Design a protein. Structure first.
Ligand SMILES: [Zn+2]
Ligand SMILES: [Zn+2]
Ligand SMILES: [Zn+2]
Ligand SMILES: [Zn+2]
Ligand SMILES: [Zn+2]
Ligand SMILES: [Zn+2]
Ligand SMILES: [Zn+2]
Ligand SMILES: [Zn+2]
Ligand SMILES: [Zn+2]
Ligand SMILES: [Zn+2]
Ligand SMILES: [Zn+2]
Ligand SMILES: [Zn+2]
Lengths: 112, 110, 110, 112, 110, 110
């Protein structure tokens, strides 16, 4: 089966349900759900990771990225370091997350 | 399906159309109900319908017209303001218009 | 579609064609009725039809040919000037032409 | 009917038969033929212009351009000035011509 | 398709998939047989099959993940090193990973 | 349909394939008959067939692999040399390889 993880972002961009979660480009999981937290109004992503990937630290990072230039958006799981480190279990939360870039802001940067 | 109405005036709506999605942090929370030029000012007035369960939106919140991906569809990004709450029929004052390719090129070049 | 006719001469119309939309602030308020080179000046004269309900457009208003998105179709942006009102058969003197990629590249490089 | 004009380029790029010839973006003619001159190995373009466009000077220019960013290639006819000036007739040649840009050279410029 | 097996570990395979082409100087000489994360290191290990007639590839050779055109599919470019020959079951140590757009933009901007 | 054969070795042919067009000044004058890695050098050897009526091509001429438009197909541009003539079976020494996106990005960035 699979085990559940939670990750909150400021902006998920083009992320949707059944979006792939990948390590080093290799798909190891899928985005199960996306829901705005009622108090913080921040996108909370519920992901399901294949059970055979057990040794993922809680220091690991999630970055929302895009395949190619115009392709679909996905979650890149950067394997964390192993200082007391704890492995991610079912129902745990990945604290270190990077949000999706916004074209207008990137242009805002490049121009101004 | 229950919703409350909000109004937002822009200088340029760009590719915005009816049923365009209104999203917070990329998550769709509403839809563009109508778009109409104000009879007096000739400025685009956008009429939005927001899902009722998203009630706690301050009036300090911002609206920015953006594009999904590089070539995708145009949408309204609702930037949540810091913490008066917006009710049915209220107006969001702080709005950002849609980018214009010619103007961006005009900026980059000249 | 009750409309009134307007004329606008450009140096270059670019991708403009018949039935091209004329928009104010992104809101379509009219259509490109015809495009024809003036017999005397060999400059593109564009014949536009604007919806009758948008009457209060001053003659100080401008027309700029722009593109929807990056690769989309070309359209006429009518910039409403500040304030004589434009009537049926009048001519918009102030026009901005369509950009040419080769020239943009020529600029960017040289 | 139509009248014929000839224009030699160094490189025609994506130009082909039945390609549009336009003034100020308005199509006024079509590319009838393209053939390499046997001695000079330069692309010679034979164009046909609608008869009703009579007052085109021989000082006019032809530039091969592209519609949009990825669209098809066409001939932009820049109306010449009217100094003894002669109008273009059937079988005449447009001397002032600009060739089609090459992506590799443009990149070569931008980089080096 | 008589072939011999090779292994190559990357930090990121990007768009690489099964049946992805392995090419020398643009000429396809093999195929990506499999891709699997090493159980111990959690790093992508790519299993390649190279056509038997290309035997004289030294072990100093390099693998770089590249893209055909601008938007095309991703492939493995095998750069033949100058001159021990690679056999069936060997491992290419020298590998260059697939670029990430976000990082490229991050570089270009910052 | 009559043709004479020419050979050209590159470091990288890129997207070149069989039946790729060989053009002078954009005008197609020949086709890529075959592509094969040299057994000794592991370098792409391109076998071209040129229409017989284009006989007067000097051996000082150059071959450059280019792309049609921005996203179009890959082709061989034959740059006519200044004024020994190339015959059937001769080899063009001066060749330019196909650009690599990663290398161009590598150049632009680093
Ligand atoms: Zn669970
Ligand atoms: Zn451990
Ligand atoms: Zn309401
Ligand atoms: Zn409150
Ligand atoms: Zn009328
Ligand atoms: Zn008035
Ligand atoms: Zn004739
Ligand atoms: Zn005259
Ligand atoms: Zn094997
Ligand atoms: Zn050896
Ligand atoms: Zn032969
Ligand atoms: Zn000679």
């Amino acid at each position: 089966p699979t085990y559940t993880l939670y990750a909150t972002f400021d902006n998920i961009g083009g992320l949707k349900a059944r979006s792939p979660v990948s390590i080093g480009g290799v798909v190891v999981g899928r985005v199960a759900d996306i829901t705005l937290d009622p108090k913080t109004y921040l996108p909370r992503v519920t992901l399901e990771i294949e059970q055979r990937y057990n040794h993922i630290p809680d220091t690991s990072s999630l970055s929302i990225r895009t395949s190619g230039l115009l392709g679909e958006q996905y979650l890149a799981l950067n394997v964390g370091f192993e200082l007391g480190t704890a492995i991610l279990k079912d129902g745990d939360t990945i604290q270190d997350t990077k949000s999706a870039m916004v074209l207008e802001d990137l242009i805002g940067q490049f121009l101004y």
